[PDB]
Amino acid sequence: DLHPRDIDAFWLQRQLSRFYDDAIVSQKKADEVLEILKTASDDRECENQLVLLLGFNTFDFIKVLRQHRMMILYCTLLASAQSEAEKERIMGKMEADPELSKFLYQLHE
Amino acid sequence: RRSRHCPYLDTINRSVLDFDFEKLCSISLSHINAYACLVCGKYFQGRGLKSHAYIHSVQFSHHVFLNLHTLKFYCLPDNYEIIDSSLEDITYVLKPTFTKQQIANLDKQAKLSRAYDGTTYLPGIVGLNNIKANDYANAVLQALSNVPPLRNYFLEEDNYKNIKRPPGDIMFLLVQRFGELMRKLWNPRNFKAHVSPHEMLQAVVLCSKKTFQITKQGDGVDFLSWFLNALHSALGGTKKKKKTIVTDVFQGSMRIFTKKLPHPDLPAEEKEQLLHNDEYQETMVESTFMYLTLDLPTAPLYKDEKEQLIIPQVPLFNILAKFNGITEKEYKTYKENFLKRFQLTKLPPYLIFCIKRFTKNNFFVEKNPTIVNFPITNVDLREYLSEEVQAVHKNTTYDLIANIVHDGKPSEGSYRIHVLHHGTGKWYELQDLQVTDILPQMITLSEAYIQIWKRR
């Protein structure tokens, strides 16, 4: 269960580090995965994009994306918010979204 | 330059970081220029090449270290300080700092503070690990930390950092270590759900001359008295400033209108001679009663028609009425019958009462099991105060804030604390490391030993 409080700021890179041992390469791949997860168009098209990012194998990444696509992106953006402005923006756009609102309510409760 | 883009920061193990014990290096065993590892868990020394930290980072691949004094996260192998605000939790847990307003919103504790681990909790209701027989000291510390005066005073390092203590004094550690424990026990975002009293208990053991150590348990009343005296003598600095935080928050004034008896084996004339020659005179010796030792009556050691339970109950009002002016008490001094009588001149804001439920028999040391039927909602000592200044004390409606009960046999006994938490109304009972919920009616059931009441 990918709980709202489960994902941390570095959790996206940490999970992505199971397959990539090179920290710099792992960080670059995690940032690319985030940039693909955000600004997403189609389930299969973004799945193919994630395949191009992290190989045809390692289907666990695609499974995690299917289980948490908006959840992962929103949690990573909010947790990795450098200052109060980014946190305010993320929480504001998560208040409008129903799933994100429930995610935040569970996270703070 | 390399900050804000550190890849190694994604490997910090928040679960293993425990900054409660002493802040020393792994190999160096030096307290200077320490730098704990945010991945390897342990703490090393140095912050650069040819230092223990760089070697430990290179060898163990743990490439993230934070300085315990500079409070900065740096990549020790690369000597490039990192900059990520998402890591502020580690700094907050290491150095808990309470804001000017956050140190006064302790009564507005609505949401439960969930630790970084998988355990929701509430600040203040936290357990101190029972390192060997540290139960008495842990209970006394967890009860003294409940009082908002002392907690607020110790939550601001500025209130004690500039204290002018002698350079060659070790007692200043007690005023310094207790502050760290109080700050950690009130951390709203602590990494763990409990704080280890190891540092504070070790300091208490060192600053007490082999008394009240962590190995052998001690008396809770004696430990509380010693800690209060040490805090009062440590809060003041380079002067006889009796107006300490502890002396102002938990010490009051009692006027003992005490007297003495002439002789039991003398006739009327010889007794009256001493009664008139000021040899059996009544005098006022008013002192500062930091703790009011309300003595419980010995168990009758005999059953009766009533009292289906064979535990002799006793009302708090009758117990506390002894300190009143009318109630006279006798002291069996050497070659004298010191028949005295006390009177509370002034009540402290947070009265601390410690019922001496344990005595010494002619061949052993028994513990009186009489219960103290003390209402824990409202009570007034104006019915036992001194008649001279009865109307001077505007507020007298005191309510019990924390009770520490020493259950079990005298030799092998457990020390449990039943504390009435603020913010909410639940009077939680805390074990050494277990936090439970106690019904208010059940609080007045367990035989209390030390009680602290807030005068409101």
UniProtKB/Swiss-Prot annotation, chain A:
Q: Where in the cell is it found?
A: Nucleus
**Listed disulfide bonds for this chain?**
none
Q: In which tissues is it expressed?
A: Widely expressed.
Domain description from the entry?
Contains two helicase domains. The N-terminal helicase domain has catalytic activity by itself, contrary to the C-terminal helicase domain that may have a regulatory role and enhance the activity of the first helicase domain.
What is known about its subunit structure? Component of a core complex containing at least PRPF8, SNRNP200, EFTUD2 and SNRNP40. Component of the U5 snRNP and U4/U6-U5 tri-snRNP complexes, building blocks of the spliceosome. Component of the U4/U6-U5 tri-snRNP complex composed of the U4, U6 and U5 snRNAs and at least PRPF3, PRPF4, PRPF6, PRPF8, PRPF31, SNRNP200, TXNL4A, SNRNP40, DDX23, CD2BP2, PPIH, SNU13, EFTUD2, SART1 and USP39. Component of precatalytic, catalytic and postcatalytic spliceosomal complexes. Component of the minor spliceosome, which splices U12-type introns.
Name the family. Belongs to the helicase family. SKI2 subfamily.
- What's this chain's function? Catalyzes the ATP-dependent unwinding of U4/U6 RNA duplices, an essential step in the assembly of a catalytically active spliceosome. Plays a role in pre-mRNA splicing as a core component of precatalytic, catalytic and postcatalytic spliceosomal complexes. As a component of the minor spliceosome, involved in the splicing of U12-type introns in pre-mRNAs. Involved in spliceosome assembly, activation and disassembly. Mediates changes in the dynamic network of RNA-RNA interactions in the spliceosome.
Associated disorder is: Retinitis pigmentosa 33: A retinal dystrophy belonging to the group of pigmentary retinopathies. Retinitis pigmentosa is characterized by retinal pigment deposits visible on fundus examination and primary loss of rod photoreceptor cells followed by secondary loss of cone photoreceptors. Patients typically have night vision blindness and loss of midperipheral visual field. As their condition progresses, they lose their far peripheral visual field and eventually central vision as well.
Protein name, UniProt field: U5 small nuclear ribonucleoprotein 200 kDa helicase
Q: Which source organism does the UniProt entry give?
A: Homo sapiens
Swiss-Prot record, chain B:
- What family is this protein classified in? Belongs to the peptidase C19 family.
Q: Which UniProt keywords apply?
A: Cell cycle, Cell division, Hydrolase, Isopeptide bond, Metal-binding, mRNA processing, mRNA splicing, Nucleus, Phosphoprotein, Spliceosome, Ubl conjugation, Ubl conjugation pathway, Zinc, Zinc-finger
Q: How does it assemble?
A: The U4/U6-U5 tri-snRNP complex is a building block of the precatalytic spliceosome (spliceosome B complex). Component of the U4/U6-U5 tri-snRNP complex composed of the U4, U6 and U5 snRNAs and at least PRPF3, PRPF4, PRPF6, PRPF8, PRPF31, SNRNP200, TXNL4A, SNRNP40, SNRPB, SNRPD1, SNRPD2, SNRPD3, SNRPE, SNRPF, SNRPG, DDX23, CD2BP2, PPIH, SNU13, EFTUD2, SART1 and USP39, plus LSM2, LSM3, LSM4, LSM5, LSM6, LSM7 and LSM8.
**Described purpose of this protein according to its UniProt entry:** Deubiquitinating enzyme that plays a role in many cellular processes including cellular antiviral response, epithelial morphogenesis, DNA repair or B-cell development. Plays a role in pre-mRNA splicing as a component of the U4/U6-U5 tri-snRNP, one of the building blocks of the precatalytic spliceosome. Specifically regulates immunoglobulin gene rearrangement in a spliceosome-dependent manner, which involves modulating chromatin interactions at the Igh locus and therefore plays an essential role in B-cell development.
**Reaction equation(s) it catalyzes:** Thiol-dependent hydrolysis of ester, thioester, amide, peptide and isopeptide bonds formed by the C-terminal Gly of ubiquitin (a 76-residue protein attached to proteins as an intracellular targeting signal)
Q: Where are the zinc fingers (UBP-type)?
A: 4-101
Mainly localized where?
nucleus
| One of the record's GO molecular function terms | zinc ion binding
- The entry marks the following residues as binding Zn(2+), namely 37, 40, 56, 62
Its gene name is USP39
Q: What is its EC number?
A: 3.4.19.12
One of this protein's GO BP terms?
Answer: spliceosomal complex assembly
Q: Which organism is it from?
A: Homo sapiens (Human)
| Broadest EC class assigned to this enzyme | hydrolase
Q: Where would you find this protein in the cell? A: Nucleus
> Under the cellular component aspect of Gene Ontology, which terms does the record hold?
nucleoplasm; nucleus; spliceosomal complex; U4/U6 x U5 tri-snRNP complex
Which cysteine-cysteine pairs are annotated as disulfide bonds in the entry?
Answer: none
Q: What is this protein called?
A: Ubiquitin carboxyl-terminal hydrolase 39
Q: Which residues form the USP domain?
A: 126-456
